[PDB]
Enzyme design. Structure first.
Site, PDB file in Angstrom:
ATOM      1  CE  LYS A 136      -4.422   1.361   2.319  1.00 38.04           C
ATOM      2  NZ  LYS A 136      -5.024   1.687   3.654  1.00 38.04           N
ATOM      3  CB  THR A 189       2.046   8.426   0.032  1.00 39.98           C
ATOM      4  OG1 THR A 189       2.959   7.805   0.952  1.00 39.98           O
ATOM      5  CG2 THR A 189       1.456   9.679   0.686  1.00 39.98           C
ATOM      6  CG  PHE A 190       2.561   4.940  -4.295  1.00 39.85           C
ATOM      7  CD1 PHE A 190       2.262   3.737  -4.941  1.00 39.85           C
ATOM      8  CD2 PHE A 190       3.391   4.910  -3.174  1.00 39.85           C
ATOM      9  CE1 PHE A 190       2.783   2.522  -4.485  1.00 39.85           C
ATOM     10  CE2 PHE A 190       3.918   3.697  -2.706  1.00 39.85           C
ATOM     11  CZ  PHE A 190       3.611   2.500  -3.367  1.00 39.85           C
ATOM     12  CE  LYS A 249       4.127   1.823  -8.167  1.00 37.91           C
ATOM     13  NZ  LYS A 249       5.503   2.278  -8.554  1.00 37.91           N
ATOM     14  CG  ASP A 273      12.628   3.265  -5.047  1.00 38.42           C
ATOM     15  OD1 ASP A 273      12.787   4.424  -5.501  1.00 38.42           O
ATOM     16  OD2 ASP A 273      11.669   2.958  -4.301  1.00 38.42           O
ATOM     17  CE  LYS A 317      13.034   1.107  -0.710  1.00 42.17           C
ATOM     18  NZ  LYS A 317      12.220   1.135   0.558  1.00 42.17           N
ATOM     19  CG  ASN A 327      12.386  -1.697  -4.224  1.00 40.38           C
ATOM     20  OD1 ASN A 327      12.110  -1.166  -3.158  1.00 40.38           O
ATOM     21  ND2 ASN A 327      11.845  -1.309  -5.361  1.00 40.38           N
ATOM     22  CG  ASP A 333       8.881   0.849  -9.236  1.00 39.22           C
ATOM     23  OD1 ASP A 333       8.406   1.400  -8.205  1.00 39.22           O
ATOM     24  OD2 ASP A 333       9.357   1.497 -10.205  1.00 39.22           O
TER      25      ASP A 333
END
Length: 271
Positions: A15, A17-18, A36, A121, A123, A126, A139
């Protein structure tokens, strides 16, 4: 022409903020994708760019469609579990097993930086393995943030931040813990900027060489932060045993093979 109805819902993957990422199954075929879903109300550098960028180790965008109130990106899902998962079931990886992954990543990044695209990103969260043991830079997030210092001090996201991500990732791999895994947490901002990262004694001088360099706080100094970009990293002491052609060719053998029959095997879809 894709459409919500062409897929079956399975579970939530993430989930934000996007929006959110759902795990769905294309009803026609039976294959599995990660969808997504972005609020049109919340939101470029993500879509289009990543839609035409293909790569052995970068997740591919299978379909892209929109609803009257949202944006959807149906993307390929690796079914070999997540690196973070496997890493924790082993505390640490071998300076080679790490290297294996470190190399597929380096390849993915060289490609992206050649197209003048900063991943931002790279990390552990991911990273996933495919049915064969080959890395797949995803992603999204399925943990303390470790942004590059130039991101912290000057909100500067250039090529170099990808190498930092690389380094922090391999560091967790060969060390089993983040550079500052024990010190409080709210200490991060100051730590990452002004604290010397320390390495385990039990670490090949070349590996201690790589990290020391992937983690230079000055982007200008970092390994891969030079005009030669990914070459410095491909041509580092740590990476001599490497056939950079074999990498992109998936010619290398994964030092660990996930346990799945077909990509359709849905076992790494729980905890």
């Amino acid at each position: 022409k894709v459409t919500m109805n062409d897929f079956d819902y399975l579970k939530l993957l993430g989930k934000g903020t996007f929006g959110k990422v759902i795990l769905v199954r294309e009803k026609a075929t039976g294959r599995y994708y990660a969808m997504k879903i972005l609020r049109k109300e919340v939101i470029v550098t993500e879509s289009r760019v990543l839609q035409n960028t293909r790569h052995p180790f970068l997740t591919a965008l299978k379909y892209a469609f929109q609803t009257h109130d949202r944006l959807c990106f149906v993307m390929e899902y690796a079914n070999g579990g997540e690196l973070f998962f496997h890493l924790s079931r082993e505390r640490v990886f071998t300076e080679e097993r790490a290297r294996f992954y470190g190399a597929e990543i380096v390849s993915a990044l060289e490609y992206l930086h050649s197209r003048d695209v900063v991943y931002r990103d790279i990390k552990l969260e991911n990273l996933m393995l495919d049915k064969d043991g080959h890395i797949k830079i995803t992603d999204f997030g399925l943990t303390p943030e470790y942004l590059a210092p130039e991101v912290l001090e000057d909100n500067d996201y250039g090529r170099a931040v990808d190498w930092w991500g690389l380094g922090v990732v391999m560091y967790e791999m060969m060390c089993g813990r983040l550079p500052f895994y024990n010190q409080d947490h709210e200490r991060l901002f100051e730590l990452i900027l002004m604290e010397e990262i320390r390495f385990p004694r039990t670490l090949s001088p070349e590996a201690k060489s790589l990290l020391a360099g992937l983690l230079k706080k000055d982007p200008k100094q970092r390994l891969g932060g030079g005009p030669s970009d990914a070459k410095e990293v491909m041509e580092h002491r740590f990476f001599l045993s490497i056939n950079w052609q074999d990498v992109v060719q998936k010619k290398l053998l994964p030092p660990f093979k996930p346990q799945v029959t077909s990509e359709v095997d849905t076992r790494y879809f729980d905890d």
